[PDB]
Write an enzyme that holds these catalytic residues in place. Sequence first.
Site, short mmCIF file in Angstrom:
data_model
loop_
_atom_site.label_atom_id
_atom_site.label_comp_id
_atom_site.label_asym_id
_atom_site.label_seq_id
_atom_site.Cartn_x
_atom_site.Cartn_y
_atom_site.Cartn_z
N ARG A 347 -2.22 -33.12 61.93
CA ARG A 347 -1.15 -33.10 62.92
C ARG A 347 -1.43 -34.13 64.00
O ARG A 347 -1.21 -33.90 65.19
CB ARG A 347 -1.00 -31.71 63.53
CG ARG A 347 -1.09 -30.57 62.52
CD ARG A 347 0.19 -30.44 61.72
NE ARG A 347 0.09 -29.42 60.68
CZ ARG A 347 -0.41 -29.62 59.47
NH1 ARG A 347 -0.85 -30.81 59.10
NH2 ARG A 347 -0.47 -28.61 58.62
N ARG A 357 -5.90 -34.76 70.52
CA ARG A 357 -6.39 -33.76 69.58
C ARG A 357 -7.91 -33.70 69.68
O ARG A 357 -8.57 -34.73 69.84
CB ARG A 357 -5.97 -34.09 68.14
CG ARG A 357 -4.47 -34.11 67.92
CD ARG A 357 -3.85 -32.74 68.17
NE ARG A 357 -2.65 -32.52 67.39
CZ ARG A 357 -1.71 -31.63 67.68
NH1 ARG A 357 -1.81 -30.86 68.75
NH2 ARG A 357 -0.65 -31.52 66.89
N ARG A 363 -7.35 -23.20 59.44
CA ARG A 363 -6.37 -22.74 58.45
C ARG A 363 -5.40 -23.84 58.07
O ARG A 363 -4.95 -23.91 56.91
CB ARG A 363 -5.62 -21.52 59.00
CG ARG A 363 -4.64 -21.83 60.13
CD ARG A 363 -3.74 -20.64 60.42
NE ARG A 363 -4.43 -19.59 61.15
CZ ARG A 363 -4.42 -19.46 62.47
NH1 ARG A 363 -3.78 -20.32 63.25
NH2 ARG A 363 -5.07 -18.44 63.03
N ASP A 364 -5.08 -24.74 59.00
CA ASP A 364 -4.15 -25.83 58.72
C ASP A 364 -4.71 -26.77 57.65
O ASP A 364 -4.04 -27.07 56.66
CB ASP A 364 -3.84 -26.60 60.01
CG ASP A 364 -2.76 -25.92 60.85
OD1 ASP A 364 -2.52 -24.71 60.67
OD2 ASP A 364 -2.18 -26.60 61.72
N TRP A 494 -2.34 -15.85 61.58
CA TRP A 494 -1.52 -17.04 61.37
C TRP A 494 -0.47 -17.21 62.46
O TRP A 494 -0.12 -18.34 62.82
CB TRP A 494 -0.86 -16.98 59.99
CG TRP A 494 0.17 -18.05 59.78
CD1 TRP A 494 -0.04 -19.31 59.31
CD2 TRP A 494 1.58 -17.95 60.04
NE1 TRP A 494 1.15 -20.00 59.25
CE2 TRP A 494 2.16 -19.19 59.70
CE3 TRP A 494 2.41 -16.93 60.53
CZ2 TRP A 494 3.52 -19.44 59.83
CZ3 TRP A 494 3.76 -17.18 60.66
CH2 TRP A 494 4.30 -18.42 60.31
N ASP A 496 0.51 -17.47 65.98
CA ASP A 496 -0.07 -17.70 67.30
C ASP A 496 0.56 -16.83 68.39
O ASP A 496 -0.07 -16.60 69.42
CB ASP A 496 0.08 -19.17 67.71
CG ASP A 496 -0.52 -20.12 66.70
OD1 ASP A 496 -0.18 -21.32 66.74
OD2 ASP A 496 -1.33 -19.67 65.86
N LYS A 639 11.42 -21.16 66.92
CA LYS A 639 9.95 -21.09 66.80
C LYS A 639 9.60 -19.73 66.19
O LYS A 639 10.30 -19.25 65.29
CB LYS A 639 9.32 -21.38 68.15
CG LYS A 639 9.54 -22.80 68.65
CD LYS A 639 8.51 -23.75 68.06
CE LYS A 639 7.14 -23.54 68.69
NZ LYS A 639 6.16 -24.54 68.20
N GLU A 640 8.54 -19.08 66.67
CA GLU A 640 8.12 -17.79 66.12
C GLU A 640 9.04 -16.64 66.53
O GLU A 640 8.83 -15.52 66.06
CB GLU A 640 6.69 -17.48 66.54
CG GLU A 640 5.64 -18.38 65.88
CD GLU A 640 5.32 -19.62 66.70
OE1 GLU A 640 6.14 -19.99 67.57
OE2 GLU A 640 4.25 -20.22 66.48
N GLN A 693 8.96 -28.10 60.90
CA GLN A 693 8.18 -26.89 61.18
C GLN A 693 9.05 -25.63 61.10
O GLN A 693 8.59 -24.60 60.60
CB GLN A 693 7.52 -26.99 62.56
CG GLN A 693 6.75 -25.73 62.96
CD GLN A 693 6.18 -25.83 64.37
OE1 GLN A 693 6.87 -25.58 65.35
NE2 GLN A 693 4.90 -26.17 64.47
CL LIG Z 1 4.22 -13.42 60.88
#
Ligand SMILES: [Cl-]
Lengths: 805, 807
Positions: A347, A357, A363-364, A494, A496, A639-640, A693
């Site tokens: 990324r 960075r 995990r990525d 997973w 965040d 997003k999430e 994403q």
């Molecule tokens: Cl989830």
Amino acid sequence: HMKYGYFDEEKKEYVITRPDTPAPWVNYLGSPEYGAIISNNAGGYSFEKSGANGRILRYVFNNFDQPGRYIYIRDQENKDFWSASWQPVGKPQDVYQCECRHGTAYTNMRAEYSEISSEVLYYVPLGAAYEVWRLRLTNNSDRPRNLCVTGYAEFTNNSNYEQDQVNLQYSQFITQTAFRGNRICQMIHANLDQLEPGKDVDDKQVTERFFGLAGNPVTSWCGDKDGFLGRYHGYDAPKGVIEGKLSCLPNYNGNGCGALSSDFVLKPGEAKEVVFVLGMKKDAEVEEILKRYEIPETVCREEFHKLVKYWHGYLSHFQVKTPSREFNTMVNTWNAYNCFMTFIWSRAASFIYCGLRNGYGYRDTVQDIQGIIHLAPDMALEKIRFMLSAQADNGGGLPLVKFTHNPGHEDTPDDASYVKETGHPAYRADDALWLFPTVYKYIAETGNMDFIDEVIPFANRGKATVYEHLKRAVKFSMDHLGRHGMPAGLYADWNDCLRLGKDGESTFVAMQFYYAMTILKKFAKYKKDVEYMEFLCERQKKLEELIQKFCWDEGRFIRGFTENGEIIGKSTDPEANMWLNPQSWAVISGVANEEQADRVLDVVEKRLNTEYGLVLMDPPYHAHAFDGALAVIYNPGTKENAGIFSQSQGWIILAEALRGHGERAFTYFMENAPAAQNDRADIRKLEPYCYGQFTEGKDSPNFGRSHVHWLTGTASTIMVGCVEGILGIRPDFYGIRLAPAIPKEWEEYEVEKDFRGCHLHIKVKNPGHVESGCEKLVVNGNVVTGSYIPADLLTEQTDIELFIS
Amino acid sequence: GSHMKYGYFDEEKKEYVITRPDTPAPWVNYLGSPEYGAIISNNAGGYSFEKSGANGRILRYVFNNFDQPGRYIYIRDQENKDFWSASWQPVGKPQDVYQCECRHGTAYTNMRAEYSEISSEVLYYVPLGAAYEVWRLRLTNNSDRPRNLCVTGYAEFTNNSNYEQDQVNLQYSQFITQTAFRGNRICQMIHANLDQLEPGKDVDDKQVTERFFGLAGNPVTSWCGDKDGFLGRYHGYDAPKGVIEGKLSCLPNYNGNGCGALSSDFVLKPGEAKEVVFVLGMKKDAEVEEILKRYEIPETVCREEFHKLVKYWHGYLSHFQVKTPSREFNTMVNTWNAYNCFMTFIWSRAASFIYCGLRNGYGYRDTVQDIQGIIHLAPDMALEKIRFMLSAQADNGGGLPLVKFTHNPGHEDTPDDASYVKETGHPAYRADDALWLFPTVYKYIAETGNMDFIDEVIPFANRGKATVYEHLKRAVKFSMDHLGRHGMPAGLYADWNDCLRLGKDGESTFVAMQFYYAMTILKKFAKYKKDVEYMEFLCERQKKLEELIQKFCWDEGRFIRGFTENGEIIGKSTDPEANMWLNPQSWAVISGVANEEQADRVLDVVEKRLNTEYGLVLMDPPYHAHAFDGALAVIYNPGTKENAGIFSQSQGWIILAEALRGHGERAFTYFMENAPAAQNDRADIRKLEPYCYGQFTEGKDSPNFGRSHVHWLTGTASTIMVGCVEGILGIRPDFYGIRLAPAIPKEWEEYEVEKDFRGCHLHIKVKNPGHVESGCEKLVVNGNVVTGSYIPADLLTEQTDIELFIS
Ligand SMILES: [Cl-]
Ligand SMILES: [Cl-]
């Protein structure tokens, strides 16, 4: 519709025929060592090693896609001028024709105006640390034409973005430019040229960037941005371009630039090729580089052929021919190229990622390995070695793996130095578990059983075989259990934005753990580790009982438990009562039985599926978000917070294909396929040839709009869902099983796959038009029972014919 | 037309009039305070912020580029679809059909434009004490027919008050904002989805925050909260789609980049004028409704608030006004140097078009030195800031290099603590910080006569407390606890020069002269306090320190720059580079270390070696091929910044030096070389604002010799103001009166000074019939002849008439 381009599957290029795209559509050139991101209007920036700490070209993000790699062409007869890209001059499209072809590591910009044709091939040569803009000018009119071509590059005043953009009181006074016949040299800390060789002042020395022209003499130059643009002028009409002659003055403090002008006299039908070169090299190397391109045509075509041969050769190890054109386009070219991009660039840099960075997310990187396992197995092997060396001796993975990762001497989240250095305060429950599908999928792909016994050090101390590395990961999971005996939440999983507390329990992680024990059971069976195998059997039985007892709800698995006893994902909750990933990984891990898997997939499709994919959970968080429901800070459907998180779309696809549900797996792929959205670009906004994403969910007024291009975890999971899932390419330790899950309409399809030094030509036939099955299997003209091809049967050219109906 | 190229000074209105908008650089002005501030260029560009310029930014601004975006007002003629901006940019109409004028004043900016027989006047200001900004637009139809116009205000919000969140962390901040239309305003919500949180609770240390852009005085006819929707695809601010189409989208933003676009329809009869108000700020809906209701009929309220602002700032300025034959000197001393000093005193170095990053406190020497520039204008402000800075002094007597915004005396850490180094980023004490208290505090007490302040007990930073006199005693003790090898103050971290690393065991001549002057000032205090034992201490150590200075620092007609901790001599006449430094000689003269003829030698050589047409270089030759390990200035280009640039703060010292010796001609020419007003006819060379001071001017060793950089917020305003007031004009008070020893140019025949002093207005009339630099031929106070050049405080009446005869 208002289509902006199409896919050229012959050339493996996306060709943008209309330049006013709904967003800057970008491509990547080179590598992290020397990288260039370029938009369809020539915007972007270049860098060495670090996008934000080694930036060569200035770029203003979240704005007008400026500046860029601009080439101006001026007719000396009528003083008219235009740009080789549509922007910045932005000529009317009724008189200005253009097209932008994005390929693997190259971008070609064609334009026709005033019967003058231009073609600019932007590329970083294979293995080179500089970039090339090869311009070919062709006179299509019946008269001789006198043109003036001007190349423009806007240097940074410092490789570090903060110094160049924020510390103006310092960086505005350290640069100089100089003209040297065929190039402009920009010197950062120019006044340190008299330091003894090797010495430094305030940890600073002279650094050099260059912008040169080869193939035609330079007729005027300019190293001062303001002097080139002119007061209150934009990039659409630079003063130096307007006047037909540059100032021939350098910059001294302020903002430098590379501006080179060159005169051309073209007979009717005459074409001429020149090259602009940009990089961060010292003068002598630059002179060599420029001399290499004196006559550019042959050398540039050879470098382009080398680039194409390299990348297309990696792609050629897996090619499909199915009735679905979008599926072919994604699997054969763009998903694979995207997987290579995420594997190599992580990324690091994009038009969204523009800061510093510290290293690689655990995990990525581990998950990104999976995207290229069937294409570049040696690359995957090296990255797996690296990531296993980034595992601590307690079994957990270092959440952030430093760029200077030094196995045997690193610190962990248990050390204050690591927290102060990386900014990651604790271990995360899920990281090391991703090693299990990855490592297995590598060993199944290659048959490299020896790797199981290869000794690899841990991050902080100690060493172990790969097998023992996986055992240590399982031990880490078992050393941190919650109050239901399931893996503790620790910092996070997973997601965040889902903070369940360090003593919570994530169902995602529990199913990852179950699957990890299945994989390790395979490994222990190979190693004849009988005691550990019965240990694994008992622990898996216990964990399956625990998951079924505490996580099974109303046709769905809950999301998890908070450390305060709250149940997240319960069907009766007013918000977030249905989550996608728990059901996806109940099917993937095998915790759910056949009927249970079918039931949870049905509920997933009914409650979470939309025209553009499946929302992460539903309803979104808003008025009933608990303490750790951090996703509530984001707008609904974004997003999430109940967005269509593109990475998760891979898992569900794979899950549907593991159940033989070809229609639903393919429907999900199509709903998320960027190629399939080529006709709805205006809704999608994002590039139609790469994954983003997430997509804004149904609960947003911008339903269908995708964000964060290229560098996301989506490419790998969707690639696995397409290859391992839909196409049924399912290798194991000692062979390969073919269990496709396809849409019923497909009468037949073909797969060319390189596998263990052998080329497999696979014809899958579906005369009954079903989703899955296994009626007949013929390997090299001999019938083989079942759907399994042992490696012993593989020949250098292996013909396979699989009748599924 | 070099004569008044881009503008002129209006000394009646105390404004700078920009008549030509294509200025060589964005020429900016300041509105409000750090509480709510707004920086605005002559083309309406800039940004606004609360408390912090980079952590409380309200409007987005792209620095080091095109001065965009800004506070843009578009006027569109509905009859022919033509449109223009109230400022020249962003529309940039040809100047032969578009006339305009930008008047920068004290805390307000007035932008006039005329185009197509339509007159627009936008007055930008932050009301006194308010936490919002007002763009008051007055439209007048100068044509003989009715005109239908559509006015559109545009404000580009940030997606997060922190610049890093808004500019870098796009993957987060692009998905937290929403906009909503509410009748007469657009409200932008940061973390909008947190609107239904339980009372007082937060999620991830985040709650909903609100910004607003409203219009009062005319109904909103259309609106737009989405930047991309307002501009349109591949459109710039020069031609927004919403302006081109004559109607805004009436759609909000949901993720992405929001904005405040409001369009209002006007029908103006021939000769009819109409006033409306745009308001911007960071407040909640309930307060915004009241703010907007306040400006319903805006003419009178806006004129009243403008009057309040003008009265406040002009009344602070009126405490010292000069009338001299030099127009540039008059303009600088009366208005722009004073306004600049107030800007540097209040805003410190918080924000500008160059300073766009985070600040975590105040620099010690910077704040203490900035106090001086306003001592004769706002004495109570100076007292408060001096109290604060003395409370920022540590136990040992040294000043904290950075004073935190949360500075809590008695509970603070110090450079000797690891927590302070980690928090502030300053690892060690600096050798000169506390010494700056001595010229400051004295100059305050001399201006006011507040003797009781010497007794006032002020706490220390970390622990303990003491009187002001004991605070200066502790400062001298700190400087006495850290001596070098030549018996002079050790270099410690650094001195005033940021780029001269002499080592912690080195010795800087600058610090030695500062310490000598501090000893003299403390001697005055001890004389007042009958501390005869401490007075003998001071005289003894002062004679000693002078002996060591003259033995170890005197070179070829000059004082050396100092010693490194490795033994090198910096500033030796025989050195190939940097063999002549300005500050050592300046402060030789100021501190009184050098005698009379010695001061004359050092001033002669600094003129011969360092003086240029645009001021005196910091040192010469520039560093390049002969720089030692700590000669960090070599990283900068020659003639730039500390590498032999004309550092503008140092000029104020050398001026003062030449004025202390009575060299009126040299001091006035040194002022003229640096006066921004005097460079109004060379703006293209200067680039920087001709009405405010910069940090430095590119020296003779640069091809851009004469170009100034870093506007407004520098240390130059204070020191040059002191060189003009205490120096050139000779305004030199002490504890018990005022002395008039001016060093003026011989050409001046007579001048006047109106000064408030000790609650008394002094009307000073200086006459120089002999055309001399300095002198004292006669002194009359209220018709009575007084001996010498001194006026004791008991001679001062409410209206004190003073008449001085220099010759
Ligand atoms: Cl989830
Ligand atoms: Cl200095």
